[PDB]
Design a protein around this ligand. Structure first.
Ligand SMILES: *[C@@H]1O[C@H](CO)[C@@H](O[C@@H]2O[C@H](CO)[C@@H](O[C@@H]3O[C@H](CO[C@H]4O[C@H](CO[C@H]5O[C@H](CO)[C@@H](O)[C@H](O)[C@@H]5O)[C@@H](O)[C@H](O[C@H]5O[C@H](CO)[C@@H](O)[C@H](O)[C@@H]5O)[C@@H]4O)[C@@H](O)[C@H](O[C@H]4O[C@H](CO)[C@@H](O)[C@H](O)[C@@H]4O[C@H]4O[C@H](CO)[C@@H](O)[C@H](O)[C@@H]4O[C@H]4O[C@H](CO)[C@@H](O)[C@H](O)[C@@H]4O)[C@@H]3O)[C@H](O)[C@H]2NC(C)=O)[C@H](O)[C@H]1NC(C)=O
Ligand SMILES: *[C@@H]1O[C@H](CO)[C@@H](O[C@@H]2O[C@H](CO)[C@@H](O[C@@H]3O[C@H](CO[C@H]4O[C@H](CO)[C@@H](O)[C@H](O[C@H]5O[C@H](CO)[C@@H](O)[C@H](O)[C@@H]5O)[C@@H]4O)[C@@H](O)[C@H](O[C@H]4O[C@H](CO)[C@@H](O)[C@H](O)[C@@H]4O[C@H]4O[C@H](CO)[C@@H](O)[C@H](O)[C@@H]4O[C@H]4O[C@H](CO)[C@@H](O)[C@H](O)[C@@H]4O)[C@@H]3O)[C@H](O)[C@H]2NC(C)=O)[C@H](O)[C@H]1NC(C)=O
Ligand SMILES: *[C@@H]1O[C@H](CO)[C@@H](O[C@@H]2O[C@H](CO)[C@@H](O[C@@H]3O[C@H](CO[C@H]4O[C@H](CO)[C@@H](O)[C@H](O[C@H]5O[C@H](CO)[C@@H](O)[C@H](O)[C@@H]5O[C@H]5O[C@H](CO)[C@@H](O)[C@H](O)[C@@H]5O)[C@@H]4O)[C@@H](O)[C@H](O[C@H]4O[C@H](CO)[C@@H](O)[C@H](O)[C@@H]4O[C@H]4O[C@H](CO)[C@@H](O)[C@H](O)[C@@H]4O)[C@@H]3O)[C@H](O)[C@H]2NC(C)=O)[C@H](O)[C@H]1NC(C)=O
Ligand SMILES: *[C@@H]1O[C@H](CO)[C@@H](O[C@@H]2O[C@H](CO)[C@@H](O[C@@H]3O[C@H](CO[C@H]4O[C@H](CO[C@H]5O[C@H](CO)[C@@H](O)[C@H](O)[C@@H]5O)[C@@H](O)[C@H](O[C@H]5O[C@H](CO)[C@@H](O)[C@H](O)[C@@H]5O)[C@@H]4O)[C@@H](O)[C@H](O[C@H]4O[C@H](CO)[C@@H](O)[C@H](O)[C@@H]4O)[C@@H]3O)[C@H](O)[C@H]2NC(C)=O)[C@H](O)[C@H]1NC(C)=O
Ligand SMILES: *[C@@H]1O[C@H](CO)[C@@H](O[C@@H]2O[C@H](CO)[C@@H](O[C@@H]3O[C@H](CO)[C@@H](O)[C@H](O[C@H]4O[C@H](CO)[C@@H](O)[C@H](O)[C@@H]4O)[C@@H]3O)[C@H](O)[C@H]2NC(C)=O)[C@H](O)[C@H]1NC(C)=O
Ligand SMILES: *[C@@H]1O[C@H](CO)[C@@H](O[C@@H]2O[C@H](CO)[C@@H](O[C@@H]3O[C@H](CO)[C@@H](O)[C@H](O)[C@@H]3O)[C@H](O)[C@H]2NC(C)=O)[C@H](O)[C@H]1NC(C)=O
Ligand SMILES: *[C@@H]1O[C@H](CO)[C@@H](O[C@@H]2O[C@H](CO)[C@@H](O[C@@H]3O[C@H](CO)[C@@H](O)[C@H](O)[C@@H]3O)[C@H](O)[C@H]2NC(C)=O)[C@H](O)[C@H]1NC(C)=O
Ligand SMILES: *[C@@H]1O[C@H](CO)[C@@H](O[C@@H]2O[C@H](CO)[C@@H](O)[C@H](O)[C@H]2NC(C)=O)[C@H](O)[C@H]1NC(C)=O
Ligand SMILES: *[C@@H]1O[C@H](CO)[C@@H](O[C@@H]2O[C@H](CO)[C@@H](O)[C@H](O)[C@H]2NC(C)=O)[C@H](O)[C@H]1NC(C)=O
Ligand code: NAG
Ligand code: NAG
Ligand code: NAG
Ligand code: NAG
Ligand code: NAG
Lengths: 119, 250, 151, 213, 98, 105, 242, 151
């Protein structure tokens, strides 16, 4: 059993900054790696990047590089996602997930919860 | 063997210091290279010496919180106030980067390669951290990792910050205060390899980016303990040969 | 020559089953005392702090592993006992060779396969084999007894 | 060759037959090992027995072997029709040095033979524009391998240009043979309808074929 | 890079469907399925292997450039959109409706 | 062959992939000079002067650095030593006082 | 449990060099010897010599001791129990009778009486040695002719003429045709050329449903010419079926 | 039949001394390795926290008892050694049967009493008996020696 939950509806105008939450339980937070997905309606599920929660080591995709900012806080088991310079391109809902095991991250067995975002 | 070779348990965050060098030509090691969430370990053939220092001549000051114990700190600074750093030949370093790219192009396509500063994380990861004479450094390694290597003088001085309150292994509200070391300190490490992390979103220009990894610590040991493996001996074994248990008579 | 000269621990790992049949003492020794000779000898170095501050982190790593090595060793010596042959190294039985274990012939077993290789091909049956030797002893142990009564 | 091994031997079906090896003391047989192979003509060799008594791996007990001080022996038993091949033996020691045998056209007997099936293919239109005219006679499904070719042209004896073959063993442990006839388009065209003769079991077979057809 | 074919994907509860996916380089295959309110649900973690709560119907089956996912005996929960995932990449995906 | 019989052998050259509590060797020039406290080095045995090794002929073992427990053992150890060595050391818990900091030049 | 492959037919001339190697699979190359045997029609299958890929010890036949020299490459492991490797045998100062079907052969045991004696055998790549030129197998079709009018078959095959040297091979529909395969070898004319043919078995009822073509080739000439049998013809046993 | 089939640990607890004389291996095995086989096998379950947080409360319960089992076992193997018979299971001596230990006869000893029952009736003399076998060896050990000198 490994629960996951995030924030909710937060409307913003293009060219601004935002921030969301992603609390989790059921495992050694720092041991297993996390990641996000910019799943667009109609379009292909776009990957954003991953994060190692122990040291904070990260990896970002080019279209989201500079804009995206993945963070965390083990004192609260909560992985943050900050995103500046907003557009219509990135209006869709986001989802934070982890792999089936620490051994392999790309087998997403555990996903997040609905997070409405409006632009 | 009965025991391994001498494994110096140094703990760094970006470059691999005082380890063992490659034997023939430099080598690159990863679990899977498509697994962009997997650390690329490099092992140098030629070690590149890196000199470092905290130039300040410090004075110890024992403030006794007691009863039978005191908290030591820098009373003052005898002389000029200066910045900690690390010196390395940029010729040696980038001619070493030549060693790497050609063996990097072996695992990848002959497509041109680029190096970059760390995307993010704690000062531990985003900066070359290490102990030098008892004090913990955090060198800003943008300089060593900012280059594009294709086909068709002076030296480097990396700025460093000293931290005293530190948390190795990222423990549960458990931190360690290293007391200041008296006077100035100057130490010299051999870069023997390092850790890279690929950016898994291949681009037209791109082409393939590699920034200093070092989130987990298990690789520091893999970098040396790769040579070895453990087995359990099982000396008992049964096999047929024409011979009965000599009981044709009793 | 070859059997009367030096070889080394685990040297015949990739040598034929027949070849290895000379270099048993090599890997029949040091199963225990491979470390108790070295430990006692190297530990009496002029330190005088053997087990200082009572026991430590290396304290249990050794004892948890010291106490293993012997029972692990005494497990194989218990088999030699319970099979009635602690002459070690080599010992025949009345238990015949069920070809269901390996249909193959003698010639190639000792001169082409190696023990690492062989014990694999026979791994699954070893349990059934080992249990046959125990029941081979007890038949003999009762047959001994019966004759102790009448003479 | 050096070692003398019986060149000819035969045996009926369901029975046994023995092949022997002999030579000077140097090449046979005391203090020497003896081997036996089932070397098929046209295919890769197979191994039979070697200790000398111990069988080869994956070989039936039917094959036995013996060695006297002066000669070696091989006893295949309860025969099969797939055994019609040739057999060589060898002489060797541990340090070395295979001195191969002269071989043996063994002959498996007592089997139901069969009549052949012929297909005479004439040259096509494009081939004749090369220019060259070649008549190719085929033989299949027949054993033992024995055929006597007799081309005929204008129903006269053809002595010039005789292309014939030896019967090669087919994949079903039976035999197969082919035949040709080099000829110029000048004689080929205008030669009163061709023919092609072949025979087995003393019963001759033929298929006459036309030029302009 | 992934080529998830084909696109239309509309059938009855009493039928069978097979979704293909193409790639240049090798990798670790997987599959998902979206729902009203719900997010993508994993159904395959190696290729041959199934996820939790997955019957024998979900047949993964081909060692070659073309890999497919078959879910015979369709149902009402099967409506939604699927995607094929290989490492960081994703498939075009396909929506099946009422 | 003959009436063949099982015969049992003690001392065969056979092993299996395994994991178990290892132990550490120290160095002669390291232990002798005090260096006061240093990790948990003092509690180790000394390494044999003769760096003894035997080469294995006709073997081709499989190695995979990534799944190697010696490193899951190494860091396990490395952390344990630190914690225990700092167990007795001075606690700075009351120094959580409001620090009135001016900067330096 | 393994299999061996070799070097293809390398045509050379009397008074030249010719190299013939052997590469392994499914077994430890170092663990076993590598023997060499030809198939001289006049002499017999003469054994040339063996060599240890581990100890580098040899035992050549005094016939070619000075002539030939053997050598081996390193071993490339696949698993902990299997591997791959290479071995060689070059011969200079050639004559005419140095010919036949050449076999490489792995030993039987790692130890014992019959250590070196071969168990597993190679392909058998034929070798001729003459100063004459080389001619390509011009492929052409044949006018169809039935084998049996009772059963109902429509036999068809391709024809090769005037080729040199052996071997030549045929596969139908690029390895996409299984049953009904029948082939045979060639013979040397008074002129000095080899020539062969092929044949297949299919019915005369369904003609234009399946399509077959002969993928003929030849290693020394470097060609892979293809052909197809023209169905439009008039014979004796095939017109009764139509 | 009965001696060549299954029985079970301690099965002959209430079986005659003669009966039990076949099922020794059953209770001659597992004295040690009864637990070291099971421990090593069951402990390598996918836990990866064998001896985590160093040693604990179950830490000593086992090792204090692990280290017992072997010396306890090696105590009986030391007796087999010091009595000159580590053939185990059954072994004759020159020490004769002092009827002062038990005046009773053979017939009923092996076919009516059980070992639990018997060892009780003989418990008090075992000390004196055991010491007789040790002095039986040493007489033999000197008699051996004397003959080693002259041949
Ligand atoms: C990769 O590998 C490289 C290579 O190994 C690593 O680089 C190495 O790093 C280590 C540590 O990080 C260095 O070792 C320390 O060196 C310092 C300084 O060196 C002293 O000695 C030099 C000459 O060597 C002499 O001594 C050695 C033995 O140390 C002896 O073998 C030799 O024959 C010779 O006799 C001097 O040149 C040096 O500088 C002096 O001169 C300068 C002008 O020339 C002047 O500016 C300096 O101020 C100084 O006067 C210096 O004297 C050592 O201090 C240190 O030893 C400390 O630690 C041990 C263990 O605890 C202790 O026994 C020592 O006594 C000493 O600790 C006390 O003394 C310190 C002052 O000496 C003081 O600062 C400490 O706080 C401590 O004080 C305590 O004790 C005193 C009483 O002793 C008490 O009164 C106090 O109250 C207090 O309680 C180590 O030896 C290597 O030098 C360095 N190597 C290289 C090539 O750079 C690299 O780090 C690795 N990479 C990574 C990532 O790990
Ligand atoms: C990390 O990165 C790794 C890479 O560094 C990656 O590992 C690789 O992953 C792939 C896929 O996941 C593995 O599979 C390969 O797939 C090839 C498919 O080719 C077949 O299909 C083609 C299209 O259908 C055909 O075109 C092709 O040729 C045929 O068709 C032609 C049509 O014209 C025709 O002309 C041809 O003549 C031919 O008939 C073929 O049919 C496959 O080819 C590939 O190579 C294997 O086969 C080769 C011979 O064709 C061998 O030379 C080669 O060595 C491969 O052999 C496999 O089997 C051997 C015996 O068991 C093993 O010794 C080999 O190691 C290899 O083992 C694979 O199969 C084992 C079966 O039990 C399996 O247990 C192994 O685990 C392994 O899967 C090969 O099969 C590829 O093997 C992986 N490794 C490498 C080094 O590439 C990995 O996925 C990444 N991730 C992780 C977590 O590791
Ligand atoms: C014992 O006592 C305990 C007491 O603790 C009891 O348990 C607690 O009860 C609490 C309340 O009863 C509960 O706390 C709250 O839970 C909220 C659940 O979220 C719903 O509402 C949000 C909107 O607030 C909505 O976004 C969510 O989902 C929408 O989107 C998903 C996306 O997939 C849809 O699937 C879903 O349908 C839904 O609506 C969307 O779809 C419909 C169509 O279906 C459309 O019509 C809609 O338009 C929409 O698109 C959930 O539905 C949680 O949201 C609360 O947290 C928010 O609010 C607080 C302030 O109220 C704020 O501080 C938070 O940060 C967060 O704010 C965010 O939302 C704001 C809007 O409200 C927005 O303005 C902000 O910017 C933020 O984005 C709140 O946490 C608590 O969880 C439970 N505890 C447990 C453990 O269960 C317990 O019941 C008692 N037991 C007994 C026996 O008595
Ligand atoms: C790793 O694996 C490899 C491969 O599996 C394994 O190598 C095998 O090792 C076994 C055991 O050693 C070998 O088995 C033996 O083979 C002997 C055959 O070689 C003899 O003959 C050679 C030919 O000499 C003749 O010809 C030359 C000129 O050609 C002439 O000058 C000579 O006078 C002679 O006429 C000879 O060169 C060879 O020499 C060996 O010894 C010399 C020293 O004397 C040494 O310098 C060489 O390097 C070489 O080792 C040798 O004399 C065979 O005779 C021998 O037979 C004896 O034992 C068997 C049973 O054991 C009896 O049946 C028999 O009667 C004899 O008593 C035995 O069969 C096998 O050939 C190897 N195979 C390969 C491929 O190398 C390694 O040992 C393995 N290593 C480890 C560590 O495990
Ligand atoms: C290494 O990797 C990085 C990250 O992927 C990659 O990033 C690009 O670097 C260029 C610099 O050449 C960035 O362009 C500018 O850089 C300057 C510093 O030189 C910054 O000050 C700029 O940021 C400010 O200004 C912008 C407007 O000019 C503002 O929009 C912004 O919010 C800041 O206020 C600016 O970043 C370029 O932006 C990034 N690209 C991305 C996607 O972040 C770099 O090229 C790589 N280099 C190598 C050698 O590998
Ligand atoms: C393990 O080996 C034992 C013998 O040591 C096997 O027991 C014997 O098995 C044979 C069957 O192979 C029994 O029957 C006899 O077989 C021969 C032909 O095979 C036939 O001529 C006889 O008339 C009879 O059918 C034989 O009775 C039996 N012996 C006993 C004492 O029961 C045993 O089967 C082997 N088991 C395995 C798993 O290999
Ligand atoms: C234990 O057994 C030994 C013998 O194995 C006993 O030693 C022997 O005991 C007898 C007495 O019973 C000694 O004397 C002889 O007795 C018979 C009649 O009983 C008599 O005919 C003889 O003339 C003589 O009296 C005998 O000498 C003695 N043997 C030795 C070597 O001393 C021993 O007494 C037994 N002890 C116990 C506690 O049972
Ligand atoms: C020279 O470098 C270029 C890159 O600057 C190489 O081009 C790559 O070639 C590989 C195949 O060899 C392709 O897979 C890459 O996509 C190419 N990348 C780019 C950016 O062009 C080129 O191959 C190199 N040439 C040599 C001879 O080394
Ligand atoms: C590589 O070349 C591409 C163009 O081929 C550059 O791409 C631009 O990247 C910026 C972000 O930094 C985007 O806003 C632009 O839209 C991109 N333009 C195009 C035409 O793609 C990229 O900057 C180049 N990279 C480097 C390091 O010079
Ligand atoms: C043992 O049996 C298998 C078939 O089960 C066979 O392939 C193998 O060759 C046999 N081995 C021997 C030595 O007969
Ligand atoms: C021994 O021979 C058998 C077949 O006879 C073979 O399967 C096995 O691989 C051989 N062993 C070695 C080490 O080659
Ligand atoms: C720097 O700060 C110190 C703090 O005591 C002060 O005394 C000094 O004057 C400052 N330097 C300058 C240049 O103002
Ligand atoms: C042993 O002696 C006692 C008396 O001390 C007697 O009651 C008992 O019956 C005797 N046993 C035998 C078997 O004679
Ligand atoms: C055996 O017999 C004796 C007397 O002969 C008796 O005292 C003893 O109780 C009997 N044992 C049992 C178990 O009944």
């Amino acid at each position: 059993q490994v629960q996951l939950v995030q924030s909710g509806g937060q409307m913003k105008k293009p060219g601004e900054s935002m921030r969301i939450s992603c609390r989790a339980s059921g495992y050694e937070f720092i041991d297993c790696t996390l990641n996000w997905i910019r799943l667009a309606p109609g379009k292909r599920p776009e990957w954003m990047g991953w994060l190692k929660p122990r040291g904070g080591a990260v990896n970002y995709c080019r279209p989201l590089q500079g804009r995206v900012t993945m963070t965390r806080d083990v004192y609260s088991d909560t992985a943050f996602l900050e995103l500046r310079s907003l557009t219509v391109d990135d209006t869709a809902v986001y989802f934070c997930t982890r792999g089936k095991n620490c051994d392999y991250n790309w087998d997403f067995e555990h996903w997040g919860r609905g997070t409405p975002v409006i632009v | 063997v009965q025991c391994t070779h001498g494994i110096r348990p140094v703990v760094s965050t970006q470059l691999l210091l005082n380890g063992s060098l490659a034997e023939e030509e430099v080598v690159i090691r990863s679990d899977n290279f498509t697994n962009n969430a997997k650390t690329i370990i490099v092992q140098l053939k030629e070690s590149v010496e890196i000199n470092c220092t905290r130039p300040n001549n410090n004075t110890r000051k024992s403030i006794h919180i007691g009863p039978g114990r005191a908290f030591y700190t820098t009373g003052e600074i005898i002389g000029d106030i200066r910045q900690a750093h690390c010196n390395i030949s940029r010729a040696k370093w980038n001619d070493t980067l030549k060693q790497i790219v050609i063996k990097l192009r072996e695992q990848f396509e002959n497509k041109t390669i680029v190096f970059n500063h760390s995307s993010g994380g704690d000062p531990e990861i985003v900066m070359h951290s290490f102990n030098c004479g008892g004090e913990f450094f955090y060198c800003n390694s943008t300089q060593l990792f900012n280059s594009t290597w294709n086909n068709n003088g002076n030296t480097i001085t990396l700025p460093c910050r000293i931290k005293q309150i530190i948390n190795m292994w990222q423990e549960i509200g458990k931190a360690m205060y290293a007391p200041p070391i008296r006077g100035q300190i100057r130490c010299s490490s051999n870069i023997t390899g390092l850790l890279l992390t690929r950016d898994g979103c291949i681009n037209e220009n791109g082409t393939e980016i590699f920034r200093p990894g070092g989130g987990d610590m298990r690789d520091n040991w893999r970098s040396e303990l790769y040579k070895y493996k453990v087995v359990k001996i099982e000396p008992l074994g049964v096999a047929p040969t024409k011979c009965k248990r000599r009981v044709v008579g009793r | 020559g070859i059997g009367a000269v030096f070889l080394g621990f685990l040297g015949a790992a990739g040598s034929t089953m027949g070849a290895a049949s000379m270099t048993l003492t090599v890997q029949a020794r040091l199963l225990l005392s491979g470390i108790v000779q070295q430990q006692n000898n190297l530990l009496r170095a002029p330190e005088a702090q053997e087990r200082m501050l009572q026991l430590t982190v290396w304290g249990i790593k050794q004892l948890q592993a010291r106490v293993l090595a012997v029972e692990r060793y005494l497990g194989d010596q218990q088999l030699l006992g319970i099979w009635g042959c602690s002459g070690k190294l080599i010992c025949c039985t009345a238990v015949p060779w069920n070809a269901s274990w390996s249909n193959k012939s003698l010639d190639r077993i000792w001169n082409n396969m190696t023990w690492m290789e062989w014990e694999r091909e026979i791994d699954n049956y070893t349990s059934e084999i080992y249990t046959l030797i125990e029941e081979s002893q007890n038949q003999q142990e009762k047959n001994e007894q019966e004759l102790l009564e009448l003479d | 060759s050096v070692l003398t091994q019986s060149a000819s031997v035969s045996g009926s079906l369901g029975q046994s037959v023995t092949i022997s090896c002999t030579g000077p003391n140097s090449v046979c047989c005391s203090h020497k090992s003896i081997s036996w192979y089932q070397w098929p003509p046209g295919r890769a060799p197979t191994l039979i027995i070697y200790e000398d008594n111990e069988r080869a791996p994956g070989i039936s007990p039917r094959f036995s072997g013996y060695k006297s001080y002066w000669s070696a022996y091989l006893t295949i038993s309860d025969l099969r029709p797939e055994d019609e091949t040739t057999y060589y033996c060898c002489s060797y020691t541990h340090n070395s040095g295979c001195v191969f045998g002269t071989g043996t056209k063994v002959s498996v007997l007592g089997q139901s033979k069969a009549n052949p099936s012929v297909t005479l293919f004439p040259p096509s239109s494009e081939e004749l524009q090369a220019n060259k005219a070649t008549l190719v006679c085929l033989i299949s499904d027949f054993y033992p391998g024995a055929v006597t070719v007799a081309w005929k042209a204008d129903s006269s004896p053809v002595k010039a240009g005789v292309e014939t073959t030896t019967p090669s063993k087919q994949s079903n442990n039976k035999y197969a043979a082919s035949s040709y006839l080099s000829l110029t388009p000048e004689q080929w065209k205008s030669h009163r309808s061709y023919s092609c003769q072949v025979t087995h079991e003393g019963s001759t077979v033929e298929k006459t074929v036309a030029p302009t057809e | 890079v992934l080529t998830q074919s084909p696109g239309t994907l509309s059938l009855s509860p009493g039928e069978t469907a097979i979704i293909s996916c193409r790639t240049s380089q090798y990798g670790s295959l997987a599959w998902y399925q979206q729902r009203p309110g719900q997010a993508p649900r994993l159904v395959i973690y190696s290729g041959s292997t199934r996820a939790a709560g997955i019957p024998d119907r979900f047949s993964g089956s081909r060692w070659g450039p073309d890999y497919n996912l078959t879910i015979s005996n369709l149902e009402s929960g099967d409506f939604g959109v699927y995607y094929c995932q290989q490492y960081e990449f994703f498939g075009q995906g396909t929506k099946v409706q009422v | 062959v003959e009436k063949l019989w099982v015969t049992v052998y003690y001392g065969v050259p056979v092993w299996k992939e395994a994991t178990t509590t290892l132990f550490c060797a120290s160095d002669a020039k390291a232990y002798d000079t005090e260096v006061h406290n240093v990790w948990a080095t003092h509690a180790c045995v000394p390494t044999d002067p003769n760096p003894q090794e035997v080469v294995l002929e006709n073997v081709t073992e499989h190695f995979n650095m990534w799944k190697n427990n010696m490193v899951e053992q190494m860091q396990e150890d490395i952390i344990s030593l630190w914690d225990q060595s700092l167990k007795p050391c001075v606690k700075l818990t009351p120094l959580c006082v409001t620090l009135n900091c001016k900067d330096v030049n | 449990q393994g299999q061996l492959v070799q070097s293809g037919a390398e045509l050379k001339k009397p008074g030249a060099s010719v190299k013939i190697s052997c590469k392994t699979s499914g077994y430890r190359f170092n663990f076993y010897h590598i023997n060499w045997i030809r198939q001289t029609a006049g002499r017999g299958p003469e054994w040339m010599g063996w060599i240890s890929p581990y100890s580098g010890d040899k035992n050549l036949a005094p016939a070619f001791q000075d002539r030939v020299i053997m050598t081996t490459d390193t071993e490339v492991p696949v698993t902990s129990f299997t591997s791959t490797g290479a071995a060689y045998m070059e011969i200079r100062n050639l004559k005419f009778d140095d010919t036949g079907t050449y076999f490489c052969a792995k030993g039987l045991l790692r130890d014992g009486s019959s250590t070196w004696l071969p168990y597993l055998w190679g392909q058998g790549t034929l070798l001729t040695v003459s100063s004459a030129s080389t001619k390509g197998p011009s492929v052409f079709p044949l006018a169809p002719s039935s084998k049996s009018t009772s059963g109902g078959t429509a036999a068809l095959g391709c024809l090769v003429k005037d080729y040199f040297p052996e071997p030549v091979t045929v596969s139908w529909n690029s390895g996409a045709l299984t049953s009904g395969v029948h082939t045979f070898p060639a013979v040397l004319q008074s002129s000095g050329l080899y020539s062969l043919s092929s044949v297949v078995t299919v019915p005369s009822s369904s003609l234009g449903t399946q399509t077959y073509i002969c993928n003929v080739n030849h290693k020394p000439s470097n060609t892979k010419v293809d052909k197809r049998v023209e169905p439009k013809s008039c014979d004796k046993g095939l017109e009764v079926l139509f």
